[PDB]
Design a protein around this ligand. Structure first.
Ligand SMILES: *[C@@H]1O[C@H](CO)[C@@H](O[C@@H]2O[C@H](CO)[C@@H](O)[C@H](O)[C@H]2NC(C)=O)[C@H](O)[C@H]1NC(C)=O
Ligand SMILES: *[C@@H]1O[C@H](CO)[C@@H](O)[C@H](O)[C@H]1NC(C)=O
Ligand SMILES: *[C@@H]1O[C@H](CO)[C@@H](O)[C@H](O)[C@H]1NC(C)=O
Ligand SMILES: *[C@@H]1O[C@H](CO)[C@@H](O)[C@H](O)[C@H]1NC(C)=O
Ligand SMILES: *[C@@H]1O[C@H](CO)[C@@H](O)[C@H](O)[C@H]1NC(C)=O
Ligand SMILES: *[C@@H]1O[C@H](CO)[C@@H](O)[C@H](O)[C@H]1NC(C)=O
Ligand SMILES: *[C@@H]1O[C@H](CO)[C@@H](O)[C@H](O)[C@H]1NC(C)=O
Ligand SMILES: *[C@@H]1O[C@H](CO)[C@@H](O)[C@H](O)[C@H]1NC(C)=O
Ligand SMILES: *[C@@H]1O[C@H](CO)[C@@H](O)[C@H](O)[C@H]1NC(C)=O
Ligand SMILES: *[C@@H]1O[C@H](CO)[C@@H](O)[C@H](O)[C@H]1NC(C)=O
Ligand SMILES: *[C@@H]1O[C@H](CO)[C@@H](O)[C@H](O)[C@H]1NC(C)=O
Ligand SMILES: *[C@@H]1O[C@H](CO)[C@@H](O)[C@H](O)[C@H]1NC(C)=O
Ligand SMILES: *[C@@H]1O[C@H](CO)[C@@H](O)[C@H](O)[C@H]1NC(C)=O
Lengths: 99, 189, 366, 197
């Protein structure tokens, strides 16, 4: 599970990023085609701006969470490299470091 | 008949539309055209304008249905209002293309990695018929090398193994060697 | 008067490419020291230019060509043979056209109703392009250009590049001049066409024709159609996304097509002209739609607007009528003959987008 | 131009109707002003002023700022009818029926549409504001050719082009301006000095 949820933390983020495409964000609809087929240029712009702002905020949120998780994974990988160097490649006198 | 315009009679007609997922009952005066498939076009079915490529498929729509969505609330498929045929909409763009290059002041030569594709169906995944010929030389050729990360066109594959400069993925790397050309190889551990 | 020319060799257009030429200014913002991604009707790099020339053989090239989304017209010559342009949609007295013709000192620009004769040509001495102009508004004369029919020998020395566009009722002309020495071929390199003039022609332009001069002269009693070494190049603008570099003077020093090769499109997403060694993911720029498909249900019954509107009696407002409108075609153009609408407000849809929509359950309160 | 009253509301971007489809269409990104006023007893006389024409039929919608002065016979049926009037083919232009006793919806109105550009070009038309005296090296609100900004003005030399009024920077702020009266290239520096502790 200590590995598995990591995968379950990465597939769930992309799925939520896809499912956030079906959001109005205050616009009339969540579909660019509906807005561009029902409204003219001057009046669909205020709806497309809402959709663009919402989806850009969604992408920024996803990237921020990915950066947080990448920092945590990098800390774990640094620990794993230290374990490999100090216990596989040698013998460690540190208590409870390796077993 | 001699009263002021503020008290003259007026006739008001108020029209109400619904625009549902139902067969179209009233339409605009815009006349139809001839359907073309497997080509990046702007379509307009029942007053639903979109952009993409159209393929014949069978998604088994309900009889009182016109379009089918997906989990991203995009038009996954539409029904032809004249031939009663269930078409299929695929996005024109192919995000998932990588350009592998040396420095700009080294060569104007690039290799193109197409991700998770099988190299025979590259021209129908890129739509190479609608591209400029400078793209169409990069879709097919004799430099096609199939990797586990899609496949790579524009870099010859050698059986030797070196330490690698440009990592491509799935163990495949690329470099700019010797006239001068881009080579791809399995990375040497 | 107009004389239809005989003996002329058949119009055989050769072909060449637009190697990095035709870059113009898409808008008047005056940006300086900046890389800008701009979508607009640009001339693509290495595009298929169709090429015509005047060589006496004994052929002049004044054919009739399609004006689609603006054109790029590059002319190379020795003695200023290209001396005008015809724009319009029918090129007759039944429709309004545009003439740009320059004699020895200045230009003449007239948006009028010329009855252009078949095979028009400019008569050069040491004219016969139209027959009558009437019922027209615009007239422009204040722009200089160099014209002289002299020194008719040697390889070409002048290259004049033009970009013609007709958007928002404005005829935009962009121009550039460059001295080159070539052998009957377009020189390669970069071209930045500065904005020259902006006509309020406000006319429908779909089909154009160039103008060449003729030298009948005195020393040819046989009506000598001796023309001189000149060659022009036409390319068609397409909706692309260029990357433009503006220097401190506001001039486009360099541009990237972004739809030409993978190097340009990977050069277009990284927002730099020099990419470094590595592998780059790339946004989409390569493929653009060309055709438009409209498909509506096969119903041809005109909608009863003669009973919903123009009835003998309507219902009173306290007992307002409900009528279901069904199996119609919704064109409001049939009501322009008799009724002028005092108020026409629409909520949820736009009035100009009604002709491209299909509804399901239209109801009509009255 | 001159329209009837009921069509005065059609002179607007995005509108549709008879004037906005066949006669005069405003662009969707219009930057201007539309003025219209009642012109009865000036554009209409007794017995009918049948001098103003409007196009009733057209083969296609008008593109913005496009004039259709042609007068060819519109075909509305099946036969081409060889370019004469009669059945299923009509004259495209129709005359207005302005009368002094007409209703307000049928009274003649006069419409003037002004189009503005606001470019980086020398100013051609100005408002009725009176100019003031330029002061330098002081935190002021400045209005150069309609550029209402705030800052300090310093004499400098950035060598503007002759057809220029202001020069930007990499942050799209007004880095420098040209004086409209003395043709002297000033320099705008921000009034505040964030960077103090
Ligand atoms: C402008 O001129 C053209 C000349 O061809 C007019 O005719 C249409 O041109 C388009 C060009 O693609 C054709 O597809 C149509 O079939 C033509 N005929 C029609 C619409 O009856 C065109 O109508 C003129 N006006 C505009 C606004 O384009
Ligand atoms: C409508 O027209 C198409 C071709 O234009 C034809 O195939 C079809 O049978 C017609 N009738 C319908 C869809 O009811
Ligand atoms: C796809 O690639 C596989 C190789 O793993 C190959 O066997 C197969 O024939 C390809 N599919 C085609 C060519 O349709
Ligand atoms: C490279 O290896 C492949 C693997 O079978 C082989 O078919 C090919 O002939 C080799 N090329 C050489 C040795 O040049
Ligand atoms: C060329 O002009 C002459 C003028 O007399 C005319 O008779 C002839 O019909 C014209 N050519 C064509 C193809 O119409
Ligand atoms: C473009 O034209 C030049 C000369 O006109 C030619 O050498 C070249 O092969 C052409 N094609 C390209 C650059 O694809
Ligand atoms: C340009 O178009 C002509 C039209 O027939 C064609 O023959 C020619 O091959 C085209 N040029 C290129 C470089 O494709
Ligand atoms: C020739 O140029 C003069 C100005 O030099 C101009 O007034 C005149 O209209 C022009 N005539 C023609 C036929 O172009
Ligand atoms: C052109 O203007 C004259 C001037 O009175 C007018 O009589 C005529 O009807 C107008 N139109 C045409 C097509 O001649
Ligand atoms: C800008 O234009 C001026 C005058 O046209 C010229 O002297 C100067 O060299 C230009 N700047 C650059 C960088 O070319
Ligand atoms: C309304 O319809 C009648 C016929 O029912 C017709 O005579 C009349 O011209 C129409 N238009 C009106 C009253 O504006
Ligand atoms: C337009 O209205 C006039 C008003 O009298 C009428 O005579 C004419 O027939 C109408 N045209 C149509 C309905 O096509
Ligand atoms: C306008 O007035 C100013 C002083 O009020 C004066 O210096 C200037 O010469 C005048 N003319 C122009 C063209 O600025």
């Amino acid at each position: 599970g200590k590995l598995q949820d990591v995968v379950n933390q990465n597939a769930q983020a992309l799925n939520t990023l896809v499912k956030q495409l079906s959001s109005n964000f205050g616009a009339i609809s969540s579909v660019l085609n509906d807005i561009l087929s029902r409204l003219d240029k001057v009046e669909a712009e205020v709806q497309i701006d809402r959709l663009i702002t919402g989806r850009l905020q969604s992408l920024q949120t996803y990237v921020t969470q990915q950066l947080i998780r990448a920092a945590e994974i990098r800390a774990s990988a640094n620990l794993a490299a230290t374990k490999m160097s100090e216990c596989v490649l040698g013998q460690s006198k540190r208590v409870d470091f390796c077993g | 008949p001699t009263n002021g315009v503020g008290y003259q009679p007026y006739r008001v007609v108020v029209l109400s539309f619904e625009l549902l997922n139902a067969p179209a009952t009233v339409c605009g005066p815009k006349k139809s055209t001839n359907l073309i498939k497997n080509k990046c076009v702007n379509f307009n079915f029942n007053g639903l304008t979109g952009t993409g490529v159209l393929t014949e498929s069978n998604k088994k729509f309900l009889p009182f249905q016109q379009f089918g969505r997906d989990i991203a609330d995009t038009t996954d498929a539409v029904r032809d209002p004249q031939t009663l045929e269930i078409l299929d909409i695929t996005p024109c763009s192919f995000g998932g293309v990588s350009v592998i290059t040396p420095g700009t002041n080294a060569s104007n030569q690039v290799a193109v990695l197409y991700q998770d594709v099988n190299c025979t169906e590259v021209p129908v995944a890129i739509h190479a018929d609608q591209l400029t010929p400078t793209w169409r030389v990069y879709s097919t050729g004799s430099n096609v090398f199939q990797t586990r990360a899609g496949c790579l066109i524009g870099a010859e594959h050698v059986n030797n193994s070196y330490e690698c400069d440009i990592p491509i993925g799935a163990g495949i790397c690329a470099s700019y060697q010797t006239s001068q050309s881009i080579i791809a190889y399995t990375m040497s551990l | 008067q107009c004389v239809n020319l005989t003996g002329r060799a058949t119009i055989q257009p050769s072909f060449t490419n637009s190697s990095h030429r035709g870059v113009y200014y898409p808008d008047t913002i005056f940006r300086s020291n900046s890389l800008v991604l701009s979508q607009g009707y640009f001339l693509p790099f290495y595009s298929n230019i169709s090429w015509y020339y005047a060589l006496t053989e004994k052929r002049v090239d004044n054919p009739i060509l399609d004006f689609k989304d603006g054109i790029y017209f590059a002319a190379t010559e020795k003695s200023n043979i290209v001396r005008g342009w015809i724009f319009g949609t029918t090129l007759d007295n039944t429709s309004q056209s545009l003439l740009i013709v320059n004699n020895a000192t200045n230009v003449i620009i007239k948006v009028c109703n010329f009855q252009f004769c078949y095979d028009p040509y400019l008569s050069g001495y040491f004219f016969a392009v139209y027959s009558s102009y009437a019922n027209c508004t615009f007239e422009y004369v204040s722009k200089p250009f160099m014209l002289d029919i002299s020194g008719k020998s040697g390889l070409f020395d002048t290259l004049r590049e033009f970009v013609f566009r007709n958007v928002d009722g404005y005829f935009k002309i962009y121009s550039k001049y460059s001295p080159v020495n070539v052998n009957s071929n377009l020189p390669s390199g970069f071209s930045a066409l500065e904005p020259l003039v902006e006509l309020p022609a406000g006319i429908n332009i779909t089909r154009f024709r160039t103008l060449l001069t003729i030298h009948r002269g005195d020393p040819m009693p046989n009506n000598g159609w001796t023309v001189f070494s000149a060659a022009y190049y036409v390319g068609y603008l397409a909706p692309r996304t260029f990357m433009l570099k503006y220097n401190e003077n506001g001039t486009i020093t360099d541009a990237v097509d972004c739809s030409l090769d993978p190097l340009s499109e990977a050069k277009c997403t990284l927002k730099s002209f020099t990419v470094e060694k590595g592998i780059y993911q790339t946004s989409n720029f390569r493929v653009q739609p060309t055709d438009s498909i409209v498909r509506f249900p096969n119903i041809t019954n005109l909608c009863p607007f003669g009973e919903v509107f123009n009835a003998t009696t309507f219902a009173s407002v306290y007992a307002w009528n409900r009528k279901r409108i069904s199996n119609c075609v919704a064109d409001y153009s049939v009501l322009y003959n008799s009724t002028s609408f005092s108020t026409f407000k629409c909520y949820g849809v736009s009035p100009t987008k009604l002709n491209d929509l299909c509804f399901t359950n239209v109801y009509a309160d009255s | 131009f001159v329209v009837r009253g009921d069509e005065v509301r059609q002179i607007a971007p995005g509108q549709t109707g008879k004037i906005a489809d066949y006669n005069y269409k405003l662009p969707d990104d219009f930057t201007g002003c539309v003025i219209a006023w009642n012109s009865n007893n000036l554009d209409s006389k007794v017995g009918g002023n049948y001098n103003y024409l409007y196009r009733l039929f057209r083969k296609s919608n008008l593109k913005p700022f496009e004039r259709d002065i042609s007068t060819e016979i519109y075909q509305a049926g099946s036969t081409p009818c060889n370019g004469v009037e009669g059945f299923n083919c009509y004259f495209p232009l129709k005359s207005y029926g302005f009368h002094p006793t007409n209703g307000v919806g049928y009274q003649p109105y006069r419409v003037v549409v002004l189009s503005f550009e606001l470019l980086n070009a020398p100013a051609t038309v100005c408002g009725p504001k009176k100019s003031t005296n330029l002061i330098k090296n002081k935190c002021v609100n400045f209005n150069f050719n309609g550029l209402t900004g705030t800052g300090v003005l310093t004499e400098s030399n950035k060598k503007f082009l002759p057809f220029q009024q202001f020069g930007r920077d990499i942050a799209d702020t007004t880095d420098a301006v040209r004086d409209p009266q003395t043709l002297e290239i000033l320099d705008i520096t921000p009034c505040s000095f964030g960077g103090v502790s």
